[PDB]
């Protein structure tokens with residue numbers, strides 16, 4: 366029935382959905398701002414229409430009514446939002462489904478439940494998936510100390526500020542509880558005059574584990590194993606590997622089963638990611654991303670399952686096993702390991718500020734075990750400051766994690782992007798580290814390894 370699909374996004378994810386639609390025999394429609402007129406994704410579609418005229422380009426890509434008008438005028442039957450712009454916007458999906466179009470994503474109840482921290486926590490508690498294990502809703506200093514007694518140490522507080530502000534207090538010594546709560550409440554009453562006091566069990570050096578979930582409208586929910594997104598610079602993802610080679614396979618299966626149980630309890634449809642924090646055989650639920658992730662490519666590599674094609678086919682209403690052809694959960698293969706590096710314009714010698722300018726040289730590696738998902742990184746492209754810093758996603762996969770590391774080193778040295786500074790020396794330093802190659806990297810690994818910032822002098826004749 367569905368014949369034409371509009372992508373309400375830009376960059377590499379728009380090209381990825383375009384490739385999936387062309388492989389599924391669907392016509393493609395692109396949208397682009399005036400400042401994004403030289404984007405690759407504009408010319409990779411059958412139709413391209415300017416949206417958000419007279420607006421800021423990132424506001425143009427958030428224009429719900431303009432995108433819906435373009436989809437209606439072009440005859441598009443479906444809208445794929447990609448990620449990061451309107452993929453989790455409840456109003457956009459509501460208006461798209463009210464216009465008669467197909468929103469390639471989860472249902473509206475999933476979108477508002479996982480777009481709200483309280484609702485997501487309530488769903489996780491209903492599905493018996495443990496979060497960060499404290500009596501957080503208790504508001505008392507005596508409540509805080511008894512909370513410290515019943516589960517344990519350390520304890521990190523939210524007495525400083527309500528929304529988006531954390532106390533972040535290190536509590537180890539038994540007297541440090543008492544005087545730290547004293548100073549924390551003394552600072553808390555003077556802070557803003559009004560707020561909310563929350564308690565939280567602090568997790569020291571956790572592992573960020575995400576489980577990829579696919580679900581159709583018929584009720585079949587499968588997981589596509591997990592990814593390790595622990596390599597993070599200031600709570601921002603740098604390198605994601607799949608599967609979590611550091612963790613034992615039975616523990617990874619347990620985490621994936623917990624994610625499957627949660628998504629089956631909420632009745633999840635289409636693609637989604639369940640995030641976790643992992644520490645010494647304990648895992649804690651954090652969030653559900655109700656959209657396709659940037660690092661879905663390594664899951665595709667290690668499972669052999671086209672996630673975007675499955676997204677479109679589930680949006681068509683097809684069964685996960687009968688019509689799409691995905692096997693049962695026990696028959697989902699683990700084809701090996703895979704590493705994703707996001708090459709951006711962030712200059713690591715300049716405090717990871719996104720560089721701008723014209724790319725004069727672009728050479729892309731290839732060969733065995735290499736996957737490329739390029740954005741706008743061609744030679745002669747002018748890097749605008751409006752959009753994301755990402756140039757190209759490079760994915761290396763092999764039967765063994767060590768060969769994936771070796772191939773990633775080969776392609777990071779082979780990659781030649783000139784005219785703008787890239788994070789390639791930082792990525793080389795990270796994959797050269799013995800913690801990452803062993804797979805024992807945690808979320809605090811980047812900030813606690815200053816040797817990653819010693820970049821050698823490049824001659825550049």
Ligand SMILES: CC(=O)SCCNC(=O)CCNC(=O)[C@H](O)C(C)(C)COP(=O)(O)OP(=O)(O)OC[C@H]1O[C@@H](n2cnc3c(N)ncnc32)[C@H](O)[C@@H]1OP(=O)(O)O
Pocket residue numbers: 726775776778779780781783823824825826
């Ligand atoms: C297929 C693979 O496995 S490649 C994996 C690693 N890639 C390479 O070794 C590519 C060849 N080597 C190089 O280009 C460089 O010497 C590097 C990558 C080792 C060092 O990087 P840089 O310091 O920034 O470049 P360098 O100053 O040394 O070389 C200058 C130019 O001579 C070129 N060059 C490099 N090797 C040769 C060569 N054997 N013959 C002719 N030109 C060469 C480089 O391409 C470079 O051009 P560029 O500006 O487009 O990058």
